[PDB]
Amino acid sequence: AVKLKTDFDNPRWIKRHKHMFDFLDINGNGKITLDEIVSKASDDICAKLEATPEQTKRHQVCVEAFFRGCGMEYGKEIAFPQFLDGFKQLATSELKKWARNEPTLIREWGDAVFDIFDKDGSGTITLDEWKAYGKISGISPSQEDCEATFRHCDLDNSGDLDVDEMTRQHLGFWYTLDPEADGLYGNGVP
Ligand SMILES: O=C1N2C=C(c3ccc(O)cc3)N=C(Cc3ccccc3)C2=N[C@@]1(Cc1ccc(O)cc1)OO
């Protein structure tokens, strides 16, 4: 039973996103742009994961939608406070879709990442594949933290992760500060 109640004023939820913001703020001037974010997704991440042009584009579209959901746009610098209020709007919009049994932006982003890793048609992500993602995206480079993610989640009998489980975890991790989601990224993200 995922937590659907928001906790936007919680110091821990704020710090989780402040951590992500600072992680995306390259030169550390206290601001980020959609340009820099999409570049990371397409020129860096997708390239190293050897995604096809179509997979790269699908992934790009998902990222653009996720961050535009935070009020971000190309050519505009965003400061943390504004980024955070934007994230609160994305979160409520996502929870509304969840309440309507409509696919969320984080679920669709997940589908795009999972497809890039869908080779033998496993339709899932293995520990090694996630380890690669953690390193290439930079969100969780430590092998230990990636192993912590898999120990944290409910895996199938083969030890692989499925998109519904990751979506479920992410909804609680990014949006509602679900106690069940705490620890999702080991020490990689608070
Ligand atoms: O969830 C994810 N992320 C959340 C945030 C993020 C950023 C700012 C916030 O305030 C909060 C969260 N940043 C990145 C990393 C990234 C950023 C920009 C472009 C590409 C990648 C990121 N990568 C994901 C991708 C993913 C999505 C669904 C899945 O099922 C599996 C994997 O795996 O962690």
Side-chain angles (χ1 to χ4, degrees), residues 33-53:
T33 72
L34 183 62
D35 308 63
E36 305 167 306
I37 285 177
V38 173
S39 175
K40 178 182 181 66
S42 304
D43 313 331
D44 188 0
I45 295 173
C46 282
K48 293 177 176 54
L49 291 182
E50 304 179 305
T52 64

Side-chain angles (χ1 to χ4, degrees), residues 23 26 35 57 67 81 100 108 116 123 146 156 162 170:
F23 160 69
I26 297 302
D35 308 63
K57 174 66 173 188
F67 290 97
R100 295 176 172 172
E108 300 183 320
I116 291 172
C146 291
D156 58 33
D162 73 70
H170 272 163

